[PDB]
Amino acid sequence: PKYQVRWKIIESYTFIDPTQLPYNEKWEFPRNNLQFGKTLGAGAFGKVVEATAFGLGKEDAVLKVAVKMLKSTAHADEKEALMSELKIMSHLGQHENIVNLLGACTHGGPVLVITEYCTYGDLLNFLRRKAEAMLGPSLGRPLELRDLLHFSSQVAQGMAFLASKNCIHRDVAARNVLLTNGHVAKIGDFGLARDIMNDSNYIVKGNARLPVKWMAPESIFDSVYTVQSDVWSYGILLWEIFSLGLNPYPGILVNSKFYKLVKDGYQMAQPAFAPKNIYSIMQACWALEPTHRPTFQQITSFLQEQAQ
Numbered sequence: 243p244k245y246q247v248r249w250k251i252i253e254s255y256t257f258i259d260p261t262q263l264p265y266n267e268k269w270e271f272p273r274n275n276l277q278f279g280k281t282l283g284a285g286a287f288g289k290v291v292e293a294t295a296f297g298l299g300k301e302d303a304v305l306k307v308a309v310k311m312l313k314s315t316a317h318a319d320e321k322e323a324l325m326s327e328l329k330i331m332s333h334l335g336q337h338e339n340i341v342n343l344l345g346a347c348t349h350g351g352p353v354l355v356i357t358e359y360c361t362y363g364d365l366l367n368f369l370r371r372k373a374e375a376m377l378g379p380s381l382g383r384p385l386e387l388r389d390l391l392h393f394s395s396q397v398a399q400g401m402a403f404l405a406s407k408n409c410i411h412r413d414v415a416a417r418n419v420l421l422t423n424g425h426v427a428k429i430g431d432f433g434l435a436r437d438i439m440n441d442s443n444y445i446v447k448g449n450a451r452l453p454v455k456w457m458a459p460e461s462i463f464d465s466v467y468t469v470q471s472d473v474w475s476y477g478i479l480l481w482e483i484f485s486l487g488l489n490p491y492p493g494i495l496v497n498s499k500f501y502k503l504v505k506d507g508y509q510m511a512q513p514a515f516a517p518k519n520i521y522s523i524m525q526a527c528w529a530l531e532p533t534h535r536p537t538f539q540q541i542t543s544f545l546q547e548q549a550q
């Protein structure tokens with residue numbers, strides 16, 4: 243019922259309490275120096291809105307940002323989740339292949355979290371509209387196999403960075419990958435700003451809405467989340483990419499049988515656009531034994547090599 247932050251930092255499994263993380267007032271930014279535009283994504287209690295920031299950063303830039311905020315329908319545990327998210331992003335630091343923190347507004351009003359604007363939006367929709375744009379002439383530059391490999395390595399690169407900081411995403415999916423200028427992939431998370439209550443990709447499992455089709459077995463059955471369980475989810479993401487945005491396990495209802503099959507080593511078939519090389523990587527990510535899955539660094543070095 244109560245919303246909890248998605249990413250987790252391990253210290254020992256012992257997770258650190260994000261509410262205990264410091265908030266540097268250096269990230270502080272005047273809310274008046276923001277001019278909001280259209281909403282980029284909205285959930286039940288939160289949303290992400292595009293905006294122009296004036297004098298943001300060291301070079302006093304005037305650029306377009308994405309700003310995350312809560313609605314009025316938010317309780318004390320959304321308010322805390324947003325603050326924990328902010329503290330986590332600060333702690334992690336910056337990387338080219340994640341959605342970076344640009345600033346925050348914590349004084350004189352609701353908490354606003356300012357992040358990078360990614361002009362092409364989420365990866366899943368990009369791939370879907372892209373496939374449609376290519377089938378068009380039969381019925382923007384088209385995609386090539388190299389683009390898929392680049393997207394994949396870029397996300398794995400961002401996930402490699404997170405793991406190096408002992409950070410666990412817990413919702414790795416194409417819907418949570420953003421595409422910025424030059425079509426560079428960045429791993430983020432809409433979280434509060436996603437309509438999970440009406441998203442068919444999120445299944446009711448007891449008292450939660452979970453992205454079951456992206457989840458490792460140990461997460462589904464034991465509620466265990468590791469870097470390795472993210473790797474499983476990455477394998478599903480890899481399948482999303484090389485199928486140009488198909489739903490995982492197409493047509494299959496999530497039920498007792500589905501959980502049974504997953505547990506018993508059932509794996510999706512090779513996607514239409516995946517080289518044998520890449521399907522093997524998927525299969526490795528779907529090892530039932532977590533410590534037998536590849537590390538994000540192994541995946542990154544392999545995919546970078548594949549992108550030539």
Ligand SMILES: FC(F)(F)c1ccc(CNc2ccc(Cc3c[nH]c4ncc(Cl)cc34)cn2)cn1
Pocket residue numbers: 247248249250282283290308310326327328330331341357358359360361362363364420429430431432433
């Ligand atoms: F703390 C945690 F909750 F775990 C956590 C840490 C980091 C993050 C990453 N933060 C964010 C924030 C907003 C977004 C959505 C978003 C951005 N830039 C965009 N540009 C365009 C569009 Cl169309 C959507 C976006 C994605 N990730 C999320 N949650």
